[PDB]
Amino acid sequence: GVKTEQEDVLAKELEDVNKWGLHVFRIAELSGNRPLTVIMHTIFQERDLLKTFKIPVDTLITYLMTLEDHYHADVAYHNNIHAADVVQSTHVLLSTPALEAVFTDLEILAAIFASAIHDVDHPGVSNQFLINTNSELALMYNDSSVLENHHLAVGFKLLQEENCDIFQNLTKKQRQSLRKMVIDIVLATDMSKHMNLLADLKTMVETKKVTSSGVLLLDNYSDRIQVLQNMVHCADLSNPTKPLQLYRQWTDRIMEEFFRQGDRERERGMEISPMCDKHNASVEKSQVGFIDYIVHPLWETWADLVHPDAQDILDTLEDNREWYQSTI
Ligand SMILES: CCOC(=O)c1c(NC(=O)Cc2cccs2)sc2c1CCN(C(=O)OCC)C2
Ligand SMILES: [Zn+2]
Ligand SMILES: [Zn+2]
Numbered sequence: 001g002v003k004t005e006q007e008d009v010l011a012k013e014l015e016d017v018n019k020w021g022l023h024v025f026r027i028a029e030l031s032g033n034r035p036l037t038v039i040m041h042t043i044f045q046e047r048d049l050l051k052t053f054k055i056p057v058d059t060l061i062t063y064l065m066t067l068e069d070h071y072h073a074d075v076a077y078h079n080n081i082h083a084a085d086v087v088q089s090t091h092v093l094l095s096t097p098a099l100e101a102v103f104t105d106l107e108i109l110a111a112i113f114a115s116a117i118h119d120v121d122h123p124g125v126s127n128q129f130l131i132n133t134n135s136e137l138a139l140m141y142n143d144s145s146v147l148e149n150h151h152l153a154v155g156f157k158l159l160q161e162e163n164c165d166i167f168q169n170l171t172k173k174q175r176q177s178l179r180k181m182v183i184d185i186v187l188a189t190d191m192s193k194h195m196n197l198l199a200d201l202k203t204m205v206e207t208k209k210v211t212s213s214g215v216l217l218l219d220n221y222s223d224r225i226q227v228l229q230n231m232v233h234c235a236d237l238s239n240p241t242k243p244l245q246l247y248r249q250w251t252d253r254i255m256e257e258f259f260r261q262g263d264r265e266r267e268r269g270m271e272i273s274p275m276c277d278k279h280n281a282s283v284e285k286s287q288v289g290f291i292d293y294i295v296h297p298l299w300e301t302w303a304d305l306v307h308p309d310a311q312d313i314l315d316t317l318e319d320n321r322e323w324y325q326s327t328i
Pocket of ligand 1: 126191192236237238239240250251254275286287290
């Protein structure tokens with residue numbers, strides 16, 4: 001009735017779940033490549049989500065396992081480890097003091113469940129690739145947020161497998177609210193929605209409102225869901241805000257993917273995508289490009305919304321940013 005030494009080493013690593021920069025890769029290793037399941041389960045236990053939502057634990061694990069097994073292990077970046085990381089990062093963002101007691105349990109469950117499934121069954125190529133190659137997925141979803149529609153459809157479809165309906169006890173109301181929210185969040189993970197997401201977020205910041213003991217005031221779905229979308233979006237692009245040790249493995253993995261994608265593009269006639277070009281790609285320039293133009297403005301804006309909560313995070317990102325500049 002006692003944990004194995006591995007289960008234990010694994011538990012201690014998990015003692016870090018509330019902290020930015022958990023070593024998710026070790027956990028991936030320690031758990032036999034179940035980082036998504038153990039972290040999810042840890043988070044679910046930790047937030048008491050099973051009781052609150054009457055989620056049977058065996059059902060929770062079955063779904064978790066099923067879900068994790070639908071990420072591709074043969075995909076360098078968009079796999080269950082990335083899933084797990086985004087989950088845990090979202091987890092941590094939700095705990096930010098500026099948000100204390102702001103969101104309901106259902107909104108938390110949505111944010112976390114969204115993060116868990118937001119890339120599920122990712123082929124490791126981009127929307128544009130899928131579109132240009134005339135792939136089933138692209139045709140299924142009429143070229144619009146192809147991947148993200150697919151992650152959702154799969155994440156929800158997996159609830160129907162044997163003993164997988166983790167939401168079997170929620171009322172229709174809870175379920176419809178959860179579903180809509182989860183959909184709005186995962187749809188907002190599409191990079192082409194970035195600029196708009198940020199705009200709104202800056203606007204939230206600009207037309208800011210706080211209330212009692214100083215935590216964001218949000219008295220409508222549009223505002224609530226926008227913060228959640230930006231939150232999970234931030235987690236999705238949180239890698240450059242992690243300790244360089246983490247950041248670099250993530251860059252390795254993303255670059256492996258882009259290069260592999262550029263490999264399929266180069267042969268299949270297509271002109272090697274942006275930054276995907278093998279040998280002709282500067283990873284260090286691309287990381288500065290990405291940080292300066294996309295990642296920093298997102299996190300700076302997010303940091304404002306939650307000032308001073310995200311300061312260490314934003315600082316890490318700037319350190320990491322300058323670092324890559326060393327590599328020039
Ligand atoms: C060469 C740098 O590329 C990326 O890192 C990178 C992403 N990676 C991440 O999910 C976060 C990370 C930061 C560092 C390692 S992983 S998402 C993305 C890019 C290129 C520009 N994009 C974009 O604007 O549109 C694509 C649809 C989408
Ligand atoms: Zn995605
Ligand atoms: Zn992602």
